[PDB]
């Protein structure tokens, strides 16, 4: 894809002059509320009381109250590649430069200290050799808004400054983290090039994880079912040594359950597309994908996607990962081995309505897979035994029992498996070789509020309400550091209770996921038992903890809902006693781990037959996970991009104005700006300042040599405490209301000027008369 | 003898040795044209306000009547000045080069605020203004310097 990215990164100087004549008077242009379009840009036709009359583009008029109107910033700073220049920052100017920006076609926008990347559901020419080369070795403010630029920095200040980066890349499912991650890392690999290249084996990781941990959704066809994070490691001269991943929340259950509208893991299309020779016949695998249930519940096709072509990419990686021939063959057998299991069908026979097998034809292609007897195997799903201490006991199972320990196995397989790849990789990045310091990339789901948020949603929600904390932090320390740079003190440092209140809701003890826990090990407590005790327990007690939202038309109720910091979300609990515990036929694990199965008995290598057994957790073992990457980010220089998703139909320049302002208000955007503009709202560099206000002390600031001094003197003219502001080496720092009173006084002293410009030619009229009226007054 | 400074009360006296009549005085029709024959410029509005008249011979200011009139105009410090007409002017200049449209300057002193006559605009522009440029354009610093006579700046 070699082009020229120049018109992809910059506005063209055309635009530019364009954009220079937008209709603007500082008097009178006006943002305002509206449903469909969030802002819209007006013009103050009149003003009574605190009522303002609204002129819009169109003709229409409106009528609202002054409070409603946010102040707009002048068309010089249209398209403005770092936010934290603009004069007003509030909601509609955010929204107007990044749409602007995006119609532009231009993803990337800088805000002060974070990043903001809108999807353009379009590929342009940005993420070429050619566009890289632009950004390596520049500083962020030398070159166009970029991911390049941040990871570039980060990778400078690695270097530089001995310590250890991170980027951390959210935003809602669609929204572009995966896209953004994989050029990252594609960055980190290239300039960090020496010279089965480690550069490639890194990048290659991809095509076998999305493979087997992405899925087709309604929002995204190429959504990531787990959440990820990965560590590039850099030797001591600042070249690549190796890596690790580690991947969170697998959705085990769309292996064996599919919403009509989405996909399973795209690996069972891809091994069913039969574009690898040799694959299906080993797997004993049809060529009608409706023969396996476990699969074919919603769409088994993806528009625009060639799952013949992805399989020849996928089994291509495990070859450059180093992946053997018997293990790249052994994870295609236990992948379609979870397929057959589906349709193992069974019946009753009389006492006990106690199961048996009907037919042992999927039964068969099963036990060949896993290198398992079959006789063996059936009997151990009908007919399990337990210890009582040192004897045997042969239970029975009805048909449904058997059902549902054969989805569980399902389930136990698949996820296991997908670890193991993952552990694969990370022997395969592992090098051996000095390792001094790593850059961290963050791949997970941002906060989201869906019509029904379950368990998933409350572990995505709690991970980014610690995200969001870690987040604040960060920017009061840096932004007290960018003030420092511009010689000025600036001190905020209040940390409300809210930002850990959901957390202690959610982690302390006797909270959301202690209950869950504490639920998993009582006789049956289905649910039910679980929603009241989180009731009784936290309602009207947990500040956080709220009643339900009511269900409108169409939507299970509800059980209970947390004041997340982003928003009110109503959390059904339905299901999630049965998702923390995952409990496996312990009497088929064990056959399993002496099975004919290498790799079978490896992926169960941790599971004990008759770590193994304990009272470990879906949730306790995420909350360990979780520490121990909060740990390593705190370690480290963050780096914050924010992902937003423009619209809900994949279209690329389409802007859905309330769904963008969602994601800015979950996302962390406004919440930044309010913490990097806290004490003093609008800003001004020194030349936009002499051209707006000299005008209110000419004589006074023509008089000073440096901007700063004219900046501050004229300050000092006009009726201005001087706590109102703060004089900076680059830019003045006004409170809030003091750009107002800059107005008016500009505004009176305009009305007189003309006057005196009058007078002061009367006077030079009249002193010319008066020199010949004077002649002529001798004799 | 010591309250205002000598030497300009003797100013004044000689303004109205020319522009009034030792009797009587200016008439108040000439109070803003003895003013600027004193080297200040105050607006039409503050004429009015102290003791301005419309025609002749509707009322007279003799000399101790008027040094008050001019003490005040004297006193009062922002009534205008070449830097703040720069920057007045500086809001026409579009392209940042220290010009602006001779049509628009010439709109706006007929138009806007203490408006002038067509002959006070033409008399100016003809001694302090310089010609025009193929497009129409001025230079409007000059034309304020030589109007406020402020030479430094030429
Ligand atoms: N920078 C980009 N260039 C081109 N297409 C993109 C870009 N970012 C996102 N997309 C499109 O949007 C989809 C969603 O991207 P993805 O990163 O998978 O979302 P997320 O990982 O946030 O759920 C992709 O499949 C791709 O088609
Ligand atoms: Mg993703």
């Known amino acids: ?779 | 003898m010591a309250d205002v400074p000598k030497r300009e009360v003797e100013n004044v006296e000689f303004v109205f040795e020319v522009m009034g009549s030792p009797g009587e005085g200016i008439d108040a029709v000439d109070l803003g044209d003895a003013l600027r024959a004193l080297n200040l410029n105050p607006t039409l509005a503050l004429i009015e306000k102290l003791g301005g008249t419309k025609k002749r011979n509707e009322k007279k200011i003799k000399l101790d009547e008027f040094l008050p009139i001019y003490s005040q105009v004297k006193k009062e410090k922002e009534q205008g000045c070449y830097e703040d007409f720069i920057e007045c002017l500086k809001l026409y200049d579009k392209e940042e080069n220290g010009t602006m449209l001779l049509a628009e300057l010439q709109h706006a002193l007929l138009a806007l605020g203490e408006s002038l006559d067509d002959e006070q605009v033409e008399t100016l522009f003809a001694d302090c203004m310089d010609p025009e440029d193929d497009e129409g354009f001025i230079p409007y610093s000059p034309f304020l310097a030589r109007m406020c006579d402020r030479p430094d700046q030429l």
């Open chain 1, 1 to 779: 894809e070699d082009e020229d990215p120049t018109p992809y990164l910059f506005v063209s100087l055309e635009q530019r002059r364009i954009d220079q004549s937008k209709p603007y008077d500082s008097k009178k242009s006006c943002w305002i509320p509206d449903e469909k379009e969030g802002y819209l840009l007006g013009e103050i036709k009149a003003t009574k009381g605190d009522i303002v009359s609204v002129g819009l583009q169109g003709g229409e008029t409106r009528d609202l109250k002054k409070d409603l109107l946010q102040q707009v910033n002048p068309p010089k700073y249209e398209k403005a590649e770092d936010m934290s220049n603009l004069t007003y920052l509030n909601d509609a100017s955010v929204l107007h430069n990044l749409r602007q920006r995006y119609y532009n076609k231009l993803i990337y926008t800088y805000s002060g200290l974070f990043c903001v990347a809108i999807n353009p559901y379009k590929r342009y020419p940005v993420y070429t050799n050619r566009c890289a080369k632009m950004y390596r070795g520049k500083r962020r403010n030398e070159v166009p808004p970029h991911i390049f630029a941040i990871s570039d920095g980060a990778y400078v200040d690695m270097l530089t400054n001995h310590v250890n980066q991170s980027m951390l890349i959210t935003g809602e499912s669609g929204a572009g983290k995966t896209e953004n991650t994989k050029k990252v890392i594609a960055y980190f690999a290239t300039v960090g090039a020496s010279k089965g290249s480690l550069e490639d084996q890194v990048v290659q990781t991809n095509p076998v994880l999305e493979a087997f941990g992405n899925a087709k959704t309604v929002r995204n066809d190429n959504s990531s079912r787990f959440g990820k994070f990965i560590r590039i490691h850099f030797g001591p001269t600042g070249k690549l040594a190796g890596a690790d991943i580690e991947t969170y929340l697998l959705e085990k259950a769309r292996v064996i359950s599919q919403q009509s509208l989405e996909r399973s893991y795209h690996i069972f299309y891809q091994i069913m597309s039969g574009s690898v020779p040799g694959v299906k016949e080993m797997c004993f695998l049809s060529d009608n994908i409706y023969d396996y249930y476990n699969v074919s519940q919603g769409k088994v096709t993806v528009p625009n996607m060639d799952d013949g072509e992805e399989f020849q990419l996928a089994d291509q990686a495990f070859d450059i990962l180093g992946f053997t021939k018997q293990e790249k063959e052994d994870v295609y057998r236990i992948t379609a081995a979870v397929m057959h299991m589906g349709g193992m069908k069974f019946k009753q026979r009389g006492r006990e309505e106690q199961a048996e097998q009907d037919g042992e034809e999927e039964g068969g292609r099963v036990s060949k897979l896993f290198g398992c007897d079959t006789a063996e195997l059936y009997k151990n799903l009908l007919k399990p035994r337990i210890k009582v201490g040192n004897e045997f006991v042969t239970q029975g199972r009805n048909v449904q029992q058997v059902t549902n320990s054969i989805g569980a196995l399902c389930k136990g397989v698949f996820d296991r498996l997908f670890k193991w790849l993952v552990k694969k990789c990370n022997e395969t990045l592992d090098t051996q070789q000095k390792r001094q310091h790593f850059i961290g990339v963050l791949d997970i789901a941002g906060f989201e509020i869906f019509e029904y948020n379950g368990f998933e949603q409350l572990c995505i929600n709690f991970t980014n309400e610690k995200l969001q904390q870690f987040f604040n932090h960060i920017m009061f320390v840096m932004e007290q550091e960018e003030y420092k740079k511009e010689g000025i003190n600036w001190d905020f440092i209040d940390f409300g209770m809210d930002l850990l209140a959901c957390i202690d809701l959610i982690e302390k003890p006797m909270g959301i996921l202690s209950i869950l826990e504490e639920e998993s090990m009582f006789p049956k407590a289905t649910d039910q038992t679980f929603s009241e005790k989180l009731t009784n327990t936290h309602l009207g007690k947990s500040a956080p903890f709220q009643k339900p939202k009511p269900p409108k038309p169409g939507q299970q109720a509800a059980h209970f809902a947390i004041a997340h910091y982003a928003g009110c979300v109503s959390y059904n609990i339905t299901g999630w006693l049965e998702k923390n515990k995952d409990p496996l036929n312990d009497t088929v694990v064990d056959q399993f781990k002496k099975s004919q199965n290498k790799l079978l008995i490896e992926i169960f290598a941790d599971h004990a037959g008759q770590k193994g057994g304990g009272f470990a957790t879906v949730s306790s073992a995420y909350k360990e996970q979780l520490n121990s990457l909060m740990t390593t980010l705190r370690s480290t220089q963050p780096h914050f991009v924010r992902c937003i998703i423009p619209n809900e139909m994949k279209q690329p320049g389409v802007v859905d104005a309330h769904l963008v302002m969602h994601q800015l208000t979950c996302n962390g955007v406004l919440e930044g700006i309010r913490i990097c503009r806290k004490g003093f709202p609008n800003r001004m560099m020194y030349p936009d300042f002499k051209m707006r206000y000299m005008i209110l002390a000419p004589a006074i600031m023509a008089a000073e040599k440096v901007a700063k001094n004219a900046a501050g003197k004229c300050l000092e003219a006009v009726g201005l405490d001087p706590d109102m502001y703060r004089i900076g080496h680059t830019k003045v720092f006004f409170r809030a209301g003091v750009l107002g009173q800059m107005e008016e006084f500009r505004d009176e002293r305009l009305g007189k000027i003309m006057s005196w410009m009058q007078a002061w030619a009367r006077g030079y009229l009249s002193r010319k008369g008066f020199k010949k009226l004077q002649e002529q007054r001798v004799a």
